[PDB]
Amino acid sequence: GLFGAIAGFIENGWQGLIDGWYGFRHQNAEGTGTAADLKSTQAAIDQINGKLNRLIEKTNDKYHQIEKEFEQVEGRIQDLEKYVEDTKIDLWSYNAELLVALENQHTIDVTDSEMNKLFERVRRQLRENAEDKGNGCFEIFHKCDNNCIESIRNGTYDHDIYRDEAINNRFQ
Amino acid sequence: GNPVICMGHHAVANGTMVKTLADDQVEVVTAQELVESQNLPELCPSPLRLVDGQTCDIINGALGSPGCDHLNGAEWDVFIERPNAVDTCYPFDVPEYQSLRSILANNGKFEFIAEEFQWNTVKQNGKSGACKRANVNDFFNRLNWLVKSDGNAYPLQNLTKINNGDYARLYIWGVHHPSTDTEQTNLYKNNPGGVTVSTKTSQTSVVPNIGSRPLVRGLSSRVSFYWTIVEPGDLIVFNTIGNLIAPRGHYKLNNQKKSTILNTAIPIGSCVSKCHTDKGSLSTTKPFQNISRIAVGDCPRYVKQGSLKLATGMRNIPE
Ligand SMILES: CC(=O)N[C@@H]1[C@@H](O)[C@H](O[C@@H]2O[C@H](CO[C@]3(C(=O)O)C[C@H](O)[C@@H](NC(C)=O)[C@H]([C@H](O)[C@H](O)CO)O3)[C@H](O)[C@H](O)[C@H]2O)[C@@H](CO)O[C@H]1O
Ligand SMILES: *[C@@H]1O[C@H](CO)[C@@H](O)[C@H](O)[C@H]1NC(C)=O
Ligand SMILES: *[C@@H]1O[C@H](CO)[C@@H](O)[C@H](O)[C@H]1NC(C)=O
């Protein structure tokens, strides 16, 4: 992954996270929780089914072609027919191999990207109220109950509410 | 100040290996196979029209060999030719065999139009024990075997068919090859015989060959088959001093020829599929298949690889 999030500074994935591709895991005074992030999840999924659909159904509708199996050699004409078919098959096999390698390299970067976007979005909501711990986690320097946590998850967290408490904790 | 919030992603216990430009084995959460490697053990009779030749191959169908009567009027997207097709008539060859077979197959229909040939004093409808029909000596039902009169005449034959319809016509005609000059003489009197079939733009001439040939269906003699396409506005002239296996009419050609032929022993079933291989129909949405290079219809592309996995999910890093 180009972004270094998945299999990077996020050390591993969460098997317990079963209702989304990405999400939040918190610990505050009243306990711990894990919740999926819908928007990051959907963005990744949309970009992947997009590839799927461009792939599945294109147009190879072919009827009369050329003979492709022969009992006995005939020479020149048969040689050409076999050479044309063998040439055609190698080119398509090459196309299929390259296609899957490009798509997969792209898919992995996209999913690594969405992980990083989610992390960066939360970081921006938190302003000066929190610090990156380096493992995809933020230390929050004010009391943050379940309602608070949820406000960060749904994007209504108002950093001004907690800023004075947070600044004081970070710097004294 | 010490609550903590972590951002993360899902994982599963065991994911699927895929390739990238960089790595041949990368574990991702989900993947999808792009190569179809399973086929149906049968051919789907819908939505393409398949005609099963059964015992007759397409050439024998065209000539009207015995056993091929089920092919009269037949219309197909794909003619299904059987490997165990069996000769049932006079030993014959076709000099440009694969070319005739292609034309018949591509054309896509057996629509025969009887025509009246006023052959001179010669007698018509020669038959053989090599071509028994209902245990009675017979011949190709699209062909007319001409021989000398009882009063030993084979006058130079010369009649003409004019195309003023709105479709190209296909005439199939043959040339008989006796094993002896005695055989030749008792049949056509003249020696040597000869055929020339002409159009405005072509003329094709065949000199009969006489020789000892292997016994096929109890015969050392042979028939060689030829064809002539007559476009509208053109016409066909038949010329003989002996040895002509004459047409009884013409096959109709479509302006647009869109059909083909598939040689396979696979039985026709009751499934639905637009993709047919010589190993059976495919029922798939995958873009590729490794089942056979021989494929007709709306098919995945044939490739050499047995598997190609598309990642449909992120990297799998569990715990
Ligand atoms: C014609 C003649 O005067 N001679 C008679 C021979 O036909 C016959 O010779 C035997 O012929 C055997 C098979 O004969 C056929 C056949 O294919 O069924 C009989 C057909 O009626 C005849 N068709 C015609 C004349 O249009 C056909 C044809 O001549 C040849 O196929 C052309 O090559 O002959 C087979 O060859 C035997 O090996 C041979 O003994 C003899 C003996 O029965 O009788 C003669 O009167
Ligand atoms: C037959 O041949 C003659 C010359 O031999 C030619 O002039 C004539 O057009 C032909 N007629 C028919 C009925 O084939
Ligand atoms: C097609 O692929 C499968 C594995 O996916 C393999 O077992 C089979 O041999 C392949 N078919 C051919 C004709 O190579």
DSSP letters along B98-161, please?
A: HHHHHHHHHH-B--EEE------SSBP---EEEEEETTEEE--TTEEE-B--TTS--PPEEEEE
Strands B288-289 and B35-36: parallel
User: Which residues, including other chains, have CB under 8 Å from residue B175's CB and lie 6 or more apart?
Assistant: B195, B206, B208, B223, B224, B226, B243, B244, B245
Measure B301 CA to ligand 1 centroid, in angstroms. Answer: 54
What sign results for the dihedral spanned by CA atoms A31, A35, A37, A38? negative
Is A52 in contact with B319 (Cβ distance < 8 A)?
no
Amino acid identity, position A90: D
Strands (E), B232-304: 235-242, 244-247, 249-252, 260-263, 272-273, 275-277, 280-282, 288-289, 295-298, 301-302
Q: Report yes or no: B225 and A30 within 8 Å, Cβ to Cβ.
A: no
Which site among A63, A120, A153, A172 would you substitute to test the B interface, given the most B Cβ atoms closer than 10 Å to its Cβ? A63
The Cα A3–Cα A9 span in angstroms is 10
The protein residue whose alpha carbon is closest to atom 11 in ligand 2 is B159
- Residue type at position B247: P
Say whether A96 and B300 touch across the interface (CB within 8 A): no
Q: For residue A22, what are the β-bridge partners?
A: B9
Q: What are A164's two structure tokens?
A: 């004075």
Q: What is the number of structural domains in chain A?
A: 1
Q: What is the distance of C-alpha B237 from the center of its chain? A: 27
Tell me which residue of B272, B294, B254 sits closest to B46, measured CA to CA.
Answer: B272
**Within its chain, how far is the Cα of A98 from the centroid?**
20
Measured between alpha carbons, how far is B197 from B240 in angstroms, rounded to an integer?
9
Give the pairing type, strands B301-302 and B288-289.
parallel
Question: Is the distance from the beta carbon of residue B37 to the nearest atom of ligand 3 less than 6 Å?
Answer: yes
CB B293 within 8 A of CB B273: no
- Whether residue A123 contacts residue B6, with contact meaning beta carbons closer than 8 Å, is answered with no
Residue B6, SS3?
strand
Which amino acid is residue B176, in one-letter code? H
| CB pair distance less than 8 Å for A7 and B34 | no
Is residue A35 within 8 A of residue A42, CB to CB? The reply is no
| Cα dihedral A168, A169, B3, B5 in deg (nearest 10) | 70
Interacting residues of B12 by C-beta distance below 8 A, sequence separation 6+: A15, B29, B316, B318
CA B61 to CA B100: how far, in whole Å? 12
**How many angstroms away from the CA of B316 is the closest CA of chain A?**
7
The resolution in Å comes to 2.3
Name residues whose C-beta falls within 8 Å of residue B210's C-beta, 6 or more positions apart in sequence. B177, B178, B179, B180, B181, B183, B184, B192
Q: How many helices (H) and strands (E) does chain B have?
A: 3, 29
> In which residue are the tokens 């989304």 written?
A20
Options 2.60.40.1150, 3.40.50.450, 3.90.209.20, 3.40.47.10; CATH for B49-266 is: 3.90.209.20
**CATH number, domain with residue A140:** 3.90.20.10
Dihedral over Cα of A55, A56, A57, A63: its sign:
positive
Experimental method: X-ray
**Tokens at A6, concatenated:** 């998945």
Q: What is the C-alpha separation between A161 and A172, in angstroms, rounded?
A: 19
Q: Which domain holds residue A11?
A: 1-172
Burial class of residue A6, CB neighbours in 10 A (0-12, 13-18, 19+): buried
Q: Write out the two tokens for A101.
A: 């390698």
Q: CA A5 → CA A9, A20, A26, A106, B48, distances in Å?
A: 5, 17, 18, 15, 51
Residues 6+ apart with CB under 8 A from A57: B285
CB < 8 Å from B in window 3-62 of A: 6-7, 10-15, 17-18, 20-29, 44, 48, 51-52, 55-58, 60-62
Q: Are B222 and B174 in contact (CB under 8 A)?
A: no
d(CA B200, CA B230): 9
CB atoms within 10 A of CB A42: 14
Question: By the 8 A CB rule, do B283 and B276 touch?
Answer: no
CB B308 within 8 A of CB B288: yes
Of B145, B142, B147, B159, whose CA–CA distance to B121 is shortest? B147
The amino acid at B122: V
Q: In what order do the strands lie in the sheet with B235-242?
A: B157-162, B235-242, B194-198, B203-206
- Find residues 252-291 of chain B whose CB sits inside 8 Å of chain A: 257-260, 263, 278, 285-288
Atom of ligand 2 nearest to the CA of B238: 14
Task: Copy the structure tokens of residue B215.
Answer: 């016994």
Ligand number, closest to the Cα atom of B34: 3
